[PDB]
Amino acid sequence: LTNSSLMPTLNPMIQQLALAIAASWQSLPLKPYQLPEDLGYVEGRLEGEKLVIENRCYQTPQFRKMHLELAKVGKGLDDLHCVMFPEPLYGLPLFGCDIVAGPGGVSAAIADLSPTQSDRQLPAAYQKSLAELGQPEFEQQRELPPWGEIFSEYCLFIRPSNVTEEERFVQRVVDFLQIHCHQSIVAEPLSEAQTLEHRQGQIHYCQQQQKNDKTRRVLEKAFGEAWAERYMSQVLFDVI
Numbered sequence: 001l002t003n004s005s006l007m008p009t010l011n012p013m014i015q016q017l018a019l020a021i022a023a024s025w026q027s028l029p030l031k032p033y034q035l036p037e038d039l040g041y042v043e044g045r046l047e048g049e050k051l052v053i054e055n056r057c058y059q060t061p062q063f064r065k066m067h068l069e070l071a072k073v074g075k076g077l078d079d080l081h082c083v084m085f086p087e088p089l090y091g092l093p094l095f096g097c098d099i100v101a102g103p104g105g106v107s108a109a110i111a112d113l114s115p116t117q118s119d120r121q122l123p124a125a126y127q128k129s130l131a132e133l134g135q136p137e138f139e140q141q142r143e144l145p146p147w148g149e150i151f152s153e154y155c156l157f158i159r160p161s162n163v164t165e166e167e168r169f170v171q172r173v174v175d176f177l178q179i180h181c182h183q184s185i186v187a188e189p190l191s192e193a194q195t196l197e198h199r200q201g202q203i204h205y206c207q208q209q210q211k212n213d214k215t216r217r218v219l220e221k222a223f224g225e226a227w228a229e230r231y232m233s234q235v236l237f238d239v240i
């Protein structure tokens with residue numbers, strides 16, 4: 001991230017999360033993942049503010065696509081988006097996070113390990129490890145929208161109320177990533193029927209994420225409807 005144009009000007013929580021995700025990935029058996037049109041940096045404006053986006057994307061044998069996106073709209077909204085899309089053959093859950101900030105601080109902090117099984121449960125090893133972290137206390141919880149039925153019972157969706165909560169959130173994401181990277185070493189390839197189940201779950205996850213009109217409006221204000229539809233369906237939440 002030392003080469004990032006956006007990092008130096010992003011919200012401090014976002015900065016720490018970007019670093020933590022990058023650190024988690026740094027020693028993995030990474031290969032490039034080429035986004036559509038080999039996208040890296042992109043910017044656009046229409047009648048209002050400009051949107052700037054920096055994309056990084058990788059893959060490993062366990063993760064089909066590892067995408068970390070940083071964005072800023074003018075000087076007033078920052079975002080971090082990250083999804084680790086699993087390879088269905090290994091049946092791992094989906095790691096995701098979305099952090100939205102403005103000049104008055106973080107407005108939304110979301111992180112999850114989301115199920116891909118038909119029964120909408122995380123694998124047993126994840127349930128146990130997540131349970132062992134304890135129920136975190138956050139003063140300003142937010143209710144997920146209906147499309148957010150895709151998220152697990154361990155999903156965080158808050159407005160951080162103070163620095164202690166920002167740090168607690170980051171630490172919880174660090175803990176999710178630690179659990180996830182360990183489970184990815186002990187996963188073994190699944191049966192064809194199980195693989196198919198997990199593929200289904202990942203498709204559903206992407207279709208539901210595409211219902212997020214708050215993201216879509218940010219993109220549309222800078223690039224227009226057609227661009228935004230392509231971005232959400234081909235770059236952010238591609239249906240496999």
Ligand SMILES: C=CC1=C(C)/C(=C/c2[nH]c(/C=C3N=C(/C=C4\NC(=O)C(C)=C4C=C)C(C)=C\3CCC(=O)O)c(CCC(=O)O)c2C)NC1=O
Pocket residue numbers: 053069071079080081082083095096097098100107108110111112144145148157212214215218219
């Ligand atoms: C260019 C990329 C990008 C942008 C611009 C973006 C913006 C964005 N996401 C938001 C919400 C949100 N974002 C999520 C969740 C997620 N979203 C994800 O991309 C992932 C991976 C998850 C979860 C793992 C949810 C649940 C909300 C709240 C939606 C709502 O309030 O209706 C919001 C509203 C913030 C608020 O209400 O305080 C904005 C502006 N998200 C992005 O990804």
